[PDB]
CSV table of C-alpha atoms in Angstrom, one decimal:
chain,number,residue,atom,x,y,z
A,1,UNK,CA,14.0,22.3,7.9
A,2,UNK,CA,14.9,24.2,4.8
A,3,UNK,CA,13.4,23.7,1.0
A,4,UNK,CA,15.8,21.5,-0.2
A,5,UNK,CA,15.8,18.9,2.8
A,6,UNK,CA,11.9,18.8,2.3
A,7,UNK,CA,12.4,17.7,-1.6
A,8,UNK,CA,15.1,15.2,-0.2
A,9,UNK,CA,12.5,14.0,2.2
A,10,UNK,CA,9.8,13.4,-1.0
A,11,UNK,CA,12.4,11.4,-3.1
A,12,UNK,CA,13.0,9.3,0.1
A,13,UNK,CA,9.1,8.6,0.6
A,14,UNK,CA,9.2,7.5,-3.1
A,15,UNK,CA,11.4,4.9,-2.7
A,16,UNK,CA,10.0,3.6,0.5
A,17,UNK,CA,6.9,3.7,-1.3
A,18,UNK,CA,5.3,6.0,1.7
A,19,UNK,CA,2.9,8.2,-0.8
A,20,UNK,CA,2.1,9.8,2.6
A,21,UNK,CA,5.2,11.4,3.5
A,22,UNK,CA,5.7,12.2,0.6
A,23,UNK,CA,2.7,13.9,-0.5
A,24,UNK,CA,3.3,16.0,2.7
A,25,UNK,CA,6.9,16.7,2.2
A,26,UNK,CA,5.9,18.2,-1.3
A,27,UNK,CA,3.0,19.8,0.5
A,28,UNK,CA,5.2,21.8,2.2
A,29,UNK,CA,7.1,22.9,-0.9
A,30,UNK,CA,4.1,24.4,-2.4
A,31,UNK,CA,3.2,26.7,0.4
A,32,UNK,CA,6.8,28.6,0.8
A,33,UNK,CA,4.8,30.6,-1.8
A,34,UNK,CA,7.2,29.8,-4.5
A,35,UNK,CA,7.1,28.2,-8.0
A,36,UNK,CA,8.0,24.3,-8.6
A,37,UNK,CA,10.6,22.9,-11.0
A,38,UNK,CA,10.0,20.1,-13.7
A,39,UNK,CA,11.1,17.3,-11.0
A,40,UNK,CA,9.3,18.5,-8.1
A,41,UNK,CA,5.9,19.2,-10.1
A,42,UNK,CA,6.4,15.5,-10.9
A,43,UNK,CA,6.7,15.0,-7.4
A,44,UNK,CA,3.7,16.7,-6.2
A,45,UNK,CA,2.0,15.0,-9.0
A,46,UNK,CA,3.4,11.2,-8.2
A,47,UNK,CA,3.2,11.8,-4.5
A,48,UNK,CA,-1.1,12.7,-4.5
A,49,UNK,CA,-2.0,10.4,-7.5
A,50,UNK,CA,-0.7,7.6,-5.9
A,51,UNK,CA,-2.4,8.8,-2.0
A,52,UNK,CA,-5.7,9.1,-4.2
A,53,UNK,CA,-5.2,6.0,-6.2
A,54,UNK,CA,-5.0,4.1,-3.1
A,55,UNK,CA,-8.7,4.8,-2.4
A,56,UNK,CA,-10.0,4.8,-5.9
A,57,UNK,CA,-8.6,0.7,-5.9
A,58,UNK,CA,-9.9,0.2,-2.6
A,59,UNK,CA,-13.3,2.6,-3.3
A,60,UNK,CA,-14.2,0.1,-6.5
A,61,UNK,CA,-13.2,-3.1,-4.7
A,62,UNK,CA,-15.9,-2.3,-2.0
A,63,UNK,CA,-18.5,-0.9,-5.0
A,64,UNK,CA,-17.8,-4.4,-6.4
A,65,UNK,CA,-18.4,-6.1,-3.2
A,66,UNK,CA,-22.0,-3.1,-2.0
A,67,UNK,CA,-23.3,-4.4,-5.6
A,68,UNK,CA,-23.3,-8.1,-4.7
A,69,UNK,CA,-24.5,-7.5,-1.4
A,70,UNK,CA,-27.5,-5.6,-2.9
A,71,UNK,CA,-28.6,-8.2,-5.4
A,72,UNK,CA,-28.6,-10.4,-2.5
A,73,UNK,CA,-30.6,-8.6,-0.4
A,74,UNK,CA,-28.3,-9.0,2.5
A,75,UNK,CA,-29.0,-5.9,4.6
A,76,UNK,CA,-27.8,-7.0,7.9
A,77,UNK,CA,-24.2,-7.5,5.8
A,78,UNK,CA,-24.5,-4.6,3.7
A,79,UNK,CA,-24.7,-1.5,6.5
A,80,UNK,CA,-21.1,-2.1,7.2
A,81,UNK,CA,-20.1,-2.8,4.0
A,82,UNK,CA,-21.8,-0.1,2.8
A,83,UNK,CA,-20.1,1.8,5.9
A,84,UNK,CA,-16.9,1.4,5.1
A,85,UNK,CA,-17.9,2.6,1.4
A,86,UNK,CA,-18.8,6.2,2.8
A,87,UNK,CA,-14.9,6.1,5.2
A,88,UNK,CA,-12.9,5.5,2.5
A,89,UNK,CA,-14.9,8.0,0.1
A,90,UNK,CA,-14.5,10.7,3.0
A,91,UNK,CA,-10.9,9.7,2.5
A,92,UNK,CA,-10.5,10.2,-0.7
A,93,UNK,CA,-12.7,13.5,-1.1
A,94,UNK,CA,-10.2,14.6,1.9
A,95,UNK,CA,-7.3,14.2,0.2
A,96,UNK,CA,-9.0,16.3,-3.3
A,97,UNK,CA,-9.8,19.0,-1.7
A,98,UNK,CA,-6.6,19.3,-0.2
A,99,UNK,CA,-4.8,18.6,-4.3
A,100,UNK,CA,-7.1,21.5,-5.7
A,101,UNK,CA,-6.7,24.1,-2.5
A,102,UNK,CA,-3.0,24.1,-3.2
A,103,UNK,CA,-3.8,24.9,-7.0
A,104,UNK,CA,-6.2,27.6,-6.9
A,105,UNK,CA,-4.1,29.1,-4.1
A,106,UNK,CA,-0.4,28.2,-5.0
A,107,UNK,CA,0.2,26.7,-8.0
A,108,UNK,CA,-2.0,28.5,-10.9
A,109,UNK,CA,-2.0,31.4,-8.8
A,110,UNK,CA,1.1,31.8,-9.3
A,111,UNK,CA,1.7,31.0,-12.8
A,112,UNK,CA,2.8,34.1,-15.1
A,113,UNK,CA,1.2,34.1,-18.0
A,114,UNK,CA,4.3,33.7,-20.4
A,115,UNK,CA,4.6,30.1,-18.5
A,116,UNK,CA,2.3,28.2,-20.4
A,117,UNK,CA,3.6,24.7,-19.6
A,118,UNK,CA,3.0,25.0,-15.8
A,119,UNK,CA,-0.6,26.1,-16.2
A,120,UNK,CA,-1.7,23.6,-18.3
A,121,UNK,CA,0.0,21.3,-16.0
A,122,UNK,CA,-2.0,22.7,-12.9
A,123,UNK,CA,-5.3,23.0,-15.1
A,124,UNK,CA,-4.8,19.2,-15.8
A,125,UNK,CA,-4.2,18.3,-12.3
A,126,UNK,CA,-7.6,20.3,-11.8
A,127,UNK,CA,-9.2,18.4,-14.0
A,128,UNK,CA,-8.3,15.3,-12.9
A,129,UNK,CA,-9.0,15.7,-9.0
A,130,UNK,CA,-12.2,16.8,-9.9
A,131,UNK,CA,-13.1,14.1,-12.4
A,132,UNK,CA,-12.0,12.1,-9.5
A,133,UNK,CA,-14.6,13.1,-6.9
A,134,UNK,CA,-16.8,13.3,-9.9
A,135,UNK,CA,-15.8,9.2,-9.8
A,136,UNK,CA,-17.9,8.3,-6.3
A,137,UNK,CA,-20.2,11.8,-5.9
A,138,UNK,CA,-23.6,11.7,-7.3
A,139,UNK,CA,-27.2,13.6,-7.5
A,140,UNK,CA,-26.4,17.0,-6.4
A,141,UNK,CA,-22.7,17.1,-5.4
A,142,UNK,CA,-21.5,15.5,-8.6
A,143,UNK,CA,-23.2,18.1,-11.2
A,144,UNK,CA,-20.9,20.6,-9.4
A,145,UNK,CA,-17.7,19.1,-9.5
A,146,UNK,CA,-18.4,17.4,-13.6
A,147,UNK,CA,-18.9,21.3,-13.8
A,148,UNK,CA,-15.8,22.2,-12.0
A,149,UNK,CA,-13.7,19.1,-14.3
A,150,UNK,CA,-14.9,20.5,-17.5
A,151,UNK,CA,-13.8,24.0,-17.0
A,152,UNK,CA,-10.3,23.0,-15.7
A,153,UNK,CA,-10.5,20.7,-19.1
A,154,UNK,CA,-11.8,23.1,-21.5
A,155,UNK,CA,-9.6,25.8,-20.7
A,156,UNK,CA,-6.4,23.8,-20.4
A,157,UNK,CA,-7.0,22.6,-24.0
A,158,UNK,CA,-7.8,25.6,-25.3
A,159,UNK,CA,-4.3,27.2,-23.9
A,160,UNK,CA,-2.8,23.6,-25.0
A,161,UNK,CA,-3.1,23.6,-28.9
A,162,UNK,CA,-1.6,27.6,-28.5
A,163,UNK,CA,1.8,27.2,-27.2
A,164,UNK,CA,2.4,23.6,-27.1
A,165,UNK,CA,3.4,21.2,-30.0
A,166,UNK,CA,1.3,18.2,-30.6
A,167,UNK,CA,4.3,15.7,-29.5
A,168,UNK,CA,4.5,17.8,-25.8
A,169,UNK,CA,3.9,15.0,-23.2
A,170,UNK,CA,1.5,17.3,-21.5
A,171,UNK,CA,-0.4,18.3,-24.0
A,172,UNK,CA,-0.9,14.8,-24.9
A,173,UNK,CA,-1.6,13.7,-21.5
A,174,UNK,CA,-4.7,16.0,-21.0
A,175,UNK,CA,-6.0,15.3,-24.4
A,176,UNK,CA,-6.3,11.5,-22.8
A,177,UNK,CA,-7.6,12.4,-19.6
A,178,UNK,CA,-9.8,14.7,-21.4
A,179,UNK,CA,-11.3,12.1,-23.5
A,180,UNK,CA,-11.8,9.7,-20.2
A,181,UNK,CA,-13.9,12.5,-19.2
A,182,UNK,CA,-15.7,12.7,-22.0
A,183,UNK,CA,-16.5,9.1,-21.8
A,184,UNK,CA,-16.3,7.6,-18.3
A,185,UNK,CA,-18.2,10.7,-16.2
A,186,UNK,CA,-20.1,12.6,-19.2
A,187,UNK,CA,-21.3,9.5,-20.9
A,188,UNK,CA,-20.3,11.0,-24.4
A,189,UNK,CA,-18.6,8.5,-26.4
A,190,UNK,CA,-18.4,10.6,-29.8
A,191,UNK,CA,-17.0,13.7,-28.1
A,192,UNK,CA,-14.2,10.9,-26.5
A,193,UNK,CA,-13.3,9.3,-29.1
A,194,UNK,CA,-13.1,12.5,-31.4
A,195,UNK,CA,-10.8,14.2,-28.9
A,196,UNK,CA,-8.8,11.3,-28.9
A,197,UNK,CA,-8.4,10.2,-32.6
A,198,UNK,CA,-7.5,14.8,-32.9
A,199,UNK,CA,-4.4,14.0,-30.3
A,200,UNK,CA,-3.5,11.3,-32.1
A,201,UNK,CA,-3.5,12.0,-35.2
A,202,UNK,CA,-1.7,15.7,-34.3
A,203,UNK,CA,1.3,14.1,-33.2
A,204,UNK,CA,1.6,10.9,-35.6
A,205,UNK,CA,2.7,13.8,-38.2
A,206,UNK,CA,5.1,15.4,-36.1
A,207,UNK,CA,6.4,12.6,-34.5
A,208,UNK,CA,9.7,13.2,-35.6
A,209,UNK,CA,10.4,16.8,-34.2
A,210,UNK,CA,9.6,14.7,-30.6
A,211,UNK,CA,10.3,9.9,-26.8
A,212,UNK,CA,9.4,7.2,-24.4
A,213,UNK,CA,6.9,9.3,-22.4
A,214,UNK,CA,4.8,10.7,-25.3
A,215,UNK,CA,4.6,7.3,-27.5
A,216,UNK,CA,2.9,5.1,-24.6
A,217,UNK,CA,0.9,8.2,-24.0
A,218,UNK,CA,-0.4,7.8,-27.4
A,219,UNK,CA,-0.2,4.0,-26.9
A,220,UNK,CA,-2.8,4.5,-24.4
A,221,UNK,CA,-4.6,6.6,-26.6
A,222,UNK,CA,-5.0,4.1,-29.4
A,223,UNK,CA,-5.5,1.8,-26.6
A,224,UNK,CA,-8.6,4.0,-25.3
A,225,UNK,CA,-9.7,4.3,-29.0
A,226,UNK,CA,-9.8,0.4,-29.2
A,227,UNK,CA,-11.6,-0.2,-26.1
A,228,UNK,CA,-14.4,2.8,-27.0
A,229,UNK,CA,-14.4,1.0,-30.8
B,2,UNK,CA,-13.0,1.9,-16.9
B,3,UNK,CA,-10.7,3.5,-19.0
B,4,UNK,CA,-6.9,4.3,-19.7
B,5,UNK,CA,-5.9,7.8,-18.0
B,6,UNK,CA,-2.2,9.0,-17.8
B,7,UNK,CA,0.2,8.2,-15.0
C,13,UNK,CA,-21.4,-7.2,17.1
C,14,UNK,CA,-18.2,-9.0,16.7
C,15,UNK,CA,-19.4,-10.8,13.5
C,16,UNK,CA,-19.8,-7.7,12.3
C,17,UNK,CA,-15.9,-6.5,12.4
C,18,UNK,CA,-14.8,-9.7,11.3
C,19,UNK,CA,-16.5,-9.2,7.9
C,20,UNK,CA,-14.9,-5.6,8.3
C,21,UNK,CA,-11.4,-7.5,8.1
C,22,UNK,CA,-12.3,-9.4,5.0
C,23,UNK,CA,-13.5,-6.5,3.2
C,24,UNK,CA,-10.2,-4.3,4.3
C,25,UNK,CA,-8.0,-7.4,3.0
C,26,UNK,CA,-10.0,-6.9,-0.2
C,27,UNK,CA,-9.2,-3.6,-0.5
C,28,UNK,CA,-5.9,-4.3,0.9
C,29,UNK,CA,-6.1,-1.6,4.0
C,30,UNK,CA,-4.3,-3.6,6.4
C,31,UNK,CA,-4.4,-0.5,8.5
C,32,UNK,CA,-7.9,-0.7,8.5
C,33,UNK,CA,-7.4,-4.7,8.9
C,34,UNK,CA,-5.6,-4.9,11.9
C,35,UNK,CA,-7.8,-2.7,13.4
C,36,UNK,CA,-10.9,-4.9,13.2
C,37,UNK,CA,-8.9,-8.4,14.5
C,38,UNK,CA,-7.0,-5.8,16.9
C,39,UNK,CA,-11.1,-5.0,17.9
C,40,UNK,CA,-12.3,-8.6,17.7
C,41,UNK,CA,-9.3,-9.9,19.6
C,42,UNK,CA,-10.2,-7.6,22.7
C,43,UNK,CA,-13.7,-9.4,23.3
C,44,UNK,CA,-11.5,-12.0,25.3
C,45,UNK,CA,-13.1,-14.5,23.0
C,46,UNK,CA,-10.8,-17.5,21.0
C,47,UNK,CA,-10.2,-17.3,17.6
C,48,UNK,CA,-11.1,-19.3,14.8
C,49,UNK,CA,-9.1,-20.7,12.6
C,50,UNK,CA,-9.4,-18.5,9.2
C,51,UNK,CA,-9.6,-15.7,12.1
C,52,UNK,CA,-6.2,-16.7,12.9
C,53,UNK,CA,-5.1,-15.9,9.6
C,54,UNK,CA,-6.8,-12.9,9.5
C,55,UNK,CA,-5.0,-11.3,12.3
C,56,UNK,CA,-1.8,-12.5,11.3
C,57,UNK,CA,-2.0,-11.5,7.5
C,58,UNK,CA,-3.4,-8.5,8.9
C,59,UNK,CA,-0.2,-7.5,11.2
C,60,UNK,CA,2.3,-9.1,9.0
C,61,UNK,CA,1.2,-6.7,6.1
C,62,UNK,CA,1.4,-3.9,8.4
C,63,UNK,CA,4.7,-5.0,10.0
C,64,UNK,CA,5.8,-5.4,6.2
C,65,UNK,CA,5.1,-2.1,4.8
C,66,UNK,CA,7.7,-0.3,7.9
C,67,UNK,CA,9.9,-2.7,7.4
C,68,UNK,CA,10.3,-2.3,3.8
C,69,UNK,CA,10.6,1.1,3.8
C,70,UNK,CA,12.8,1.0,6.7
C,71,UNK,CA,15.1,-1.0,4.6
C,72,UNK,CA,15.7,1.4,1.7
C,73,UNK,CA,16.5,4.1,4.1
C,74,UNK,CA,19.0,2.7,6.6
C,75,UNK,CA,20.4,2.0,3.5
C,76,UNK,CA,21.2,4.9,2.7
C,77,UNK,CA,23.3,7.1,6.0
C,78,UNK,CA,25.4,3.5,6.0
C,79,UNK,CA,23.1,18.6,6.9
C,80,UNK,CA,21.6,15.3,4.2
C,81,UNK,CA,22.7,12.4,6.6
C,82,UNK,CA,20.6,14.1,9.3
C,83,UNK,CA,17.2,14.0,7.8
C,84,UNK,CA,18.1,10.7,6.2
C,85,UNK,CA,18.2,9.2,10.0
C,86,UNK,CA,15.6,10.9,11.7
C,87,UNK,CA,13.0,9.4,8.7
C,88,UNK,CA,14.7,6.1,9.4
C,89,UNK,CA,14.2,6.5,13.2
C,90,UNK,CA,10.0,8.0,12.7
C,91,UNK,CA,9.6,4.6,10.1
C,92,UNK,CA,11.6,2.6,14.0
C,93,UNK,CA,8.6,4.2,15.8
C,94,UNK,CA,6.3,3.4,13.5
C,95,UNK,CA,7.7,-0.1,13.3
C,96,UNK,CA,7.7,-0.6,16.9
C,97,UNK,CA,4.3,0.5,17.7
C,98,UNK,CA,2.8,-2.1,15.4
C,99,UNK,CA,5.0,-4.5,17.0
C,100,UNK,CA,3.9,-3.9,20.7
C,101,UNK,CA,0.6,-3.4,19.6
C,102,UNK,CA,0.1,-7.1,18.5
C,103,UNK,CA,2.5,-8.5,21.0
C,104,UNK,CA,0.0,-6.5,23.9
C,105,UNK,CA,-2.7,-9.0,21.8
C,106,UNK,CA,-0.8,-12.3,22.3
C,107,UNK,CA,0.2,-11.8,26.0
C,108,UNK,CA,-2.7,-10.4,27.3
C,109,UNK,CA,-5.7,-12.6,25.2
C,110,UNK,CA,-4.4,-14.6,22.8
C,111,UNK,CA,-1.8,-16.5,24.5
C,112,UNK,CA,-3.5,-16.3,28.2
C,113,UNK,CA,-6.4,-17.5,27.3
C,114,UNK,CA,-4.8,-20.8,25.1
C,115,UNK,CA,-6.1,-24.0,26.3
C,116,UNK,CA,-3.3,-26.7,27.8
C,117,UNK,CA,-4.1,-29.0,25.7
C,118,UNK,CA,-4.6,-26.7,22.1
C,119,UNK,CA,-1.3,-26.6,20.9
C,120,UNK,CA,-1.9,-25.7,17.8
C,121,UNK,CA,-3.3,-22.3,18.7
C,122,UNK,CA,-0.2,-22.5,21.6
C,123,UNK,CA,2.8,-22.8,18.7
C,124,UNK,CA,0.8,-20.1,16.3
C,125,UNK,CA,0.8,-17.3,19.1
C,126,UNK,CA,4.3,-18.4,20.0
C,127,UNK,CA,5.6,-18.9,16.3
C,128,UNK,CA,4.1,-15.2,15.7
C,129,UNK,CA,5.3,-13.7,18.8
C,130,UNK,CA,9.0,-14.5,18.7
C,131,UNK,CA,8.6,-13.1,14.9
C,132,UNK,CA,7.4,-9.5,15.5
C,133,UNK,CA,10.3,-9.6,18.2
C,134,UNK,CA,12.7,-10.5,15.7
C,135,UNK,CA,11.0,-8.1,13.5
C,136,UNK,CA,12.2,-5.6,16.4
C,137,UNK,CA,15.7,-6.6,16.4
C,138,UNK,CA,16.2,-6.0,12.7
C,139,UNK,CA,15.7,-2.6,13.7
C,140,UNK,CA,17.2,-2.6,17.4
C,141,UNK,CA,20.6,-1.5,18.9
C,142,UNK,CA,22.1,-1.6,22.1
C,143,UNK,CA,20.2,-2.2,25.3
C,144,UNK,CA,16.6,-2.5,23.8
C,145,UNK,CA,18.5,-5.2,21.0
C,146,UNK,CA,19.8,-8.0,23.8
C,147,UNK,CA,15.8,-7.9,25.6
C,148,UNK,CA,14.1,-8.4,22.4
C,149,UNK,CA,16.6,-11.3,21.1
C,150,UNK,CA,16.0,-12.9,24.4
C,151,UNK,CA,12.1,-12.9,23.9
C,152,UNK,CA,12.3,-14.2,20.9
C,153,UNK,CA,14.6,-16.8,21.7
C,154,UNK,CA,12.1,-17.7,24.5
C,155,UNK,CA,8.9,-17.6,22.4
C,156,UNK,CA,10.4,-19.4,19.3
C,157,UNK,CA,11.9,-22.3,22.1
C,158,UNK,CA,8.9,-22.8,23.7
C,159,UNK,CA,6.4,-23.3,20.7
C,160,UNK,CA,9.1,-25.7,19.4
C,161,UNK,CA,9.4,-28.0,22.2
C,162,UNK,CA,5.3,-28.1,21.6
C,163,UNK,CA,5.3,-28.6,18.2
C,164,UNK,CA,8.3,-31.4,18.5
C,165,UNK,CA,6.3,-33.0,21.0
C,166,UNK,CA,2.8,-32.7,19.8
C,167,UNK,CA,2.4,-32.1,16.1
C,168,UNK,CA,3.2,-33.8,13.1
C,169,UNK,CA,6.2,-32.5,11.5
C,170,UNK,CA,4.5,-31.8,8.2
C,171,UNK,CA,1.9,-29.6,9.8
C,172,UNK,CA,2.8,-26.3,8.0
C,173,UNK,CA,2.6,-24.7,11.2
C,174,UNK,CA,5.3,-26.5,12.8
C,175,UNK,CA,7.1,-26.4,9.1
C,176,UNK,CA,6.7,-22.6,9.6
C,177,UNK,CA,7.7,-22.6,12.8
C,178,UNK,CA,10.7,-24.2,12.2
C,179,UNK,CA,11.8,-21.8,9.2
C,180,UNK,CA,11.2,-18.4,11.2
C,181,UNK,CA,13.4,-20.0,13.9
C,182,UNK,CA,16.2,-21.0,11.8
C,183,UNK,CA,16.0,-17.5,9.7
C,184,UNK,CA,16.4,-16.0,13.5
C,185,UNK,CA,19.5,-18.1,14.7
C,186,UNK,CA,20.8,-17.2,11.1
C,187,UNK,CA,19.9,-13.3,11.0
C,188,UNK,CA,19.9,-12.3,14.8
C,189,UNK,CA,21.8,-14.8,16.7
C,190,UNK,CA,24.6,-15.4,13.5
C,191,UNK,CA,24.5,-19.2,15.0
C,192,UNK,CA,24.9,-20.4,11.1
C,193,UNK,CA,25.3,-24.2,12.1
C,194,UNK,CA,22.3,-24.3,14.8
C,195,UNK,CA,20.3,-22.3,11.9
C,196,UNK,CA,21.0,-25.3,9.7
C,197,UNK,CA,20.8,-27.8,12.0
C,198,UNK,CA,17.4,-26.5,13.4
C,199,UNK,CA,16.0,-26.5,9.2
C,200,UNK,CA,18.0,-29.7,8.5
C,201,UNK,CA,16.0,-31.7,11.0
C,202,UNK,CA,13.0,-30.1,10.6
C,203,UNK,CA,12.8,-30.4,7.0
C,204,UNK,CA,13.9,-34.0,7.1
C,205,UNK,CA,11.1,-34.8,9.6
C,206,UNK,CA,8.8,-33.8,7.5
C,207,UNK,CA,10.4,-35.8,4.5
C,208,UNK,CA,10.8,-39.3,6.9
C,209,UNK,CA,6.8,-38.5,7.4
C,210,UNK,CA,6.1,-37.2,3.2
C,211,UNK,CA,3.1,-39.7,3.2
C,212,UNK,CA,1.6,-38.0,5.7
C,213,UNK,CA,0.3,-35.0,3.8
C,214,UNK,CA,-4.1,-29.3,1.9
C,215,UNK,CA,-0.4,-30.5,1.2
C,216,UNK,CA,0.9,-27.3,-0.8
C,217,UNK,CA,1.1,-25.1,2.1
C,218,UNK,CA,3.6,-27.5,3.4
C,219,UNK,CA,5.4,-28.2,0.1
C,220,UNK,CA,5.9,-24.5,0.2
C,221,UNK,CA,7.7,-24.3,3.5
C,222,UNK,CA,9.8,-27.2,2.8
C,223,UNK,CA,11.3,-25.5,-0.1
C,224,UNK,CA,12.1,-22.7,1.7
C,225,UNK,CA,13.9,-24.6,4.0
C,226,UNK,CA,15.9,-25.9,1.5
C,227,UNK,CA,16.3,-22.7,-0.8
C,228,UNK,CA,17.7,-21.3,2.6
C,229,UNK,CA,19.9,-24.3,3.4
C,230,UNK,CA,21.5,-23.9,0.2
C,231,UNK,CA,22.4,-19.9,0.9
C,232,UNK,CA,23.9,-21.4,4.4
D,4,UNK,CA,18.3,-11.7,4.4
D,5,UNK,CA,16.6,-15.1,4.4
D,6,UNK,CA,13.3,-16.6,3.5
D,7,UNK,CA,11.1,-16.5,6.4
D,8,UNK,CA,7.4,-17.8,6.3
D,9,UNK,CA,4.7,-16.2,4.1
């Protein structure tokens, strides 16, 4: 099966809404130990954050559900609830570890450093996988990977405001994911909100050297800013 | 829980 | 502990992992013990969703083929596999528990195996060609007859099982059997049972079916 | 394709 056949495969998954398929089809794009366009970054990128979205929906449905049970005091009910908590988390750590291996290894590896827009990409993805486990770890496992999220963070914003412009969709995207992180697993609200009101503001001046993508990522942005206001 | 991007 | 896995089915359905559903009324069906009736539902939402997800991806491949046509049918045939399994899997439920162990006199449970057993082989035949097509028409056919001459007989014709019982069968001489007539004759009299009998009717699960009957008599 | 039961 050659390279091209593979990507074919990932666009078909898409449609047919198999996240699966085609996280593996894409998968196996990354390790012919090559570099990945615009479209089939976005298809790496689609194809996992759907496959871990599934059990971040699913994870918080049965949080909801482990909460109620506990106020209740329903422990007969609550060992398989509370079960089937811990299987779907193993699930989702599962497929993290498998997003980041195929970073670290693959895709920053493999980055020169003249291709700026790839690593912040990649740093971003790192970012967010880890904030992600960083979503359903805790005590000692979660201070490693909130570790591991704001390195991947910090350093992609630090190469973002270099060689990208403030209306890139990318470098607007991890100032908002950033900024969720700030607020959602760090528990700083000032630090959130100021790294999100910088973003915005950066590219309300240039909007005009930008379309669709970058204004409802700031639309989420000043939705963010709303919600943490 | 918050906004993040797509 | 079998009330255990059925509260493993609700909380799947609530995080919609009807993988992880089916699984549990697949588990809880396998203790040779009846079902209730929102356990009933359960295993049929359960398999349903399953059935659903293949078969919607199966439809915007085969799509497509009617060095690139090749991988575009061996995807559709692995989604077939996929799409068969599930179907076996609960039909292996309803012949050797569900339907075996049916009462003479419980129709209701009688017309809602049959009703869901002629559907996952019409469910096959979407997908079937050739030899393996004509044996699961025939099954269907023969599942779908026999909970009609129950529900006919035996049950109101407002109950929305036999309402439901009646659409899937029409949909099948319509889809499979391209009978358009005995499609709209078997929904015609059907649906006007139930409206001779209206006073009769927990009513909008029946409303509901009745209006499909109608929205498909209008497409016939 | 026609509407079958839900």
């Amino acid at each position: 099966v050659d390279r091209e056949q593979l990507v074919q495969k990932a666009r078909l998954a898409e449609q047919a809404e198999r996240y699966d398929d085609m996280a593996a089809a894409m998968k196996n794009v990354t390790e012919l130990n090559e570099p990945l366009s615009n479209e089939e970054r976005n298809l790496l990128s689609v194809a996992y954050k759907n496959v871990v979205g599934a059990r971040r929906s699913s994870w918080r449905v049965i949080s909801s559900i482990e909460q109620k049970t506990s106020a209740d005091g329903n422990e007969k009910k609550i060992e398989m609830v509370r079960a089937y908590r811990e299987k779907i988390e193993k699930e989702l750590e599962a497929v993290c570890q498998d997003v980041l291996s195929l970073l670290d290894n693959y895709l920053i590896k493999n980055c020169s450093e003249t291709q700026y827009e790839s690593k912040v990409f990649y740093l971003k993805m790192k970012g967010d996988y880890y904030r992600y486990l960083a979503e359903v770890a805790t005590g000692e496992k979660r201070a490693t990977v909130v570790e591991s999220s704001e390195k991947a963070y910090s350093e992609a914003h630090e190469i973002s405001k270099e060689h990208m412009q403030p209306t890139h969709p990318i470098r607007l995207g991890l100032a908002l994911n950033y900024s969720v992180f700030y607020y959602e697993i760090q528990n700083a609200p000032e630090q959130a909100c100021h790294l999100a009101k910088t973003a915005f503001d950066d590219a309300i001046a240039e909007l005009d050297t930008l379309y669709k993508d970058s204004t409802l990522i700031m639309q989420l942005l000043r939705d963010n800013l709303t919600l943490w206001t | 829980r918050s906004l993040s991007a797509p």
